[PDB]
Design a protein around this ligand. Structure first.
Ligand SMILES: CC(=O)N[C@@H]1[C@@H](O)[C@H](O)[C@@H](COP(=O)(O)O)O[C@@H]1O
Ligand SMILES: [Cl-]
Length: 230
């Protein structure tokens, strides 16, 4: 029996280290739990080392089909706080009972209903792995110090207006060099960009829109096609 992290280490070396976030566009014809589960299974068959799944209905359906680790989250829109990713202790509890192997939480220093330390503690005390979705060197190192197993770059570009087009590669290297196990996540919209994250020190790379958001991909094509007519 080898630890989940040790298994992922070996599968990343063998396969590449792709994690597919299977989150279709809200309202999409493709946003159905059976379709999310099928996307996750397809990703597993294609060599993904893990999948990210949002929501309990999607998680329950996916759990049945996949054998790779599931990173679970629940997204919420809070009345005042800008935090969205797994903000509540009850959300941690629900993901743990529904079969997530890793639970990710927003790791930012922002107004929020539950302290980051408390969310991480709740996950660990379900005997699951923790992932802190971080935005900066400072928040990432704080979450490292709180004992998060994995630091994601998921929130970089999303705490302040004007999200950059390019992914935040330097953050991957800063966190890696500081001793973090880093998942690069956010705007890795081509295989070429994902490879650059590896070059910057990523342990694995999570890709969402470019694989599982058909409408979003169509938009990128329309943008380019329209400019070429202009
Ligand atoms: C297609 C895709 O993966 N887009 C991600 C979204 O999944 C994530 O929720 C958000 C986090 O920022 P937020 O918590 O401020 O919305 O970053 C990006 O928008
Ligand atoms: Cl996400």
């Amino acid at each position: 029996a080898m630890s989940l992290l040790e298994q992922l280490d070996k599968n990343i070396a063998a396969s590449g280290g792709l994690i597919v976030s299977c989150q279709p566009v809200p309202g999409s014809p493709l946003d159905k739990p059976e379709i999310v589960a099928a996307m996750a299974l397809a990703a597993e068959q294609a060599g993904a080392v893990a999948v990210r799944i949002e929501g309990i209905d999607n998680l329950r359906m996916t759990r049945s089909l996949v054998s790779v680790p599931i990173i679970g989250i629940i997204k919420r829109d809070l009345d005042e706080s800008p935090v969205r990713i797994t903000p509540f202790l009850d959300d941690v509890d629900a993901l743990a009972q529904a079969g997530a192997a890793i639970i990710a939480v927003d790791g930012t220093a922002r107004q929020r209903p539950v302290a980051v330390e408390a969310l991480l503690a709740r996950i660990h005390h379900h005997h699951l792995l923790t992932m802190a979705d971080c935005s900066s060197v400072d928040d990432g190192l704080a979450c490292q110090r709180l004992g998060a197993d994995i630091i994601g770059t998921t929130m970089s570009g999303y705490t302040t207006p004007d999200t950059p087009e390019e992914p935040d590669l330097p953050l991957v290297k800063a966190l890696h060099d500081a001793g973090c196990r880093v998942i690069a996540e956010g705007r890795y919209n081509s295989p070429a960009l994902a490879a650059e994250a590896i070059r910057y020190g990523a342990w694995a790379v999570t890709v969402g829109s470019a694989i599982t958001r058909l409408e979003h991909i169509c938009g990128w094509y329309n943008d380019a096609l329209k400019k070429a007519a202009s």
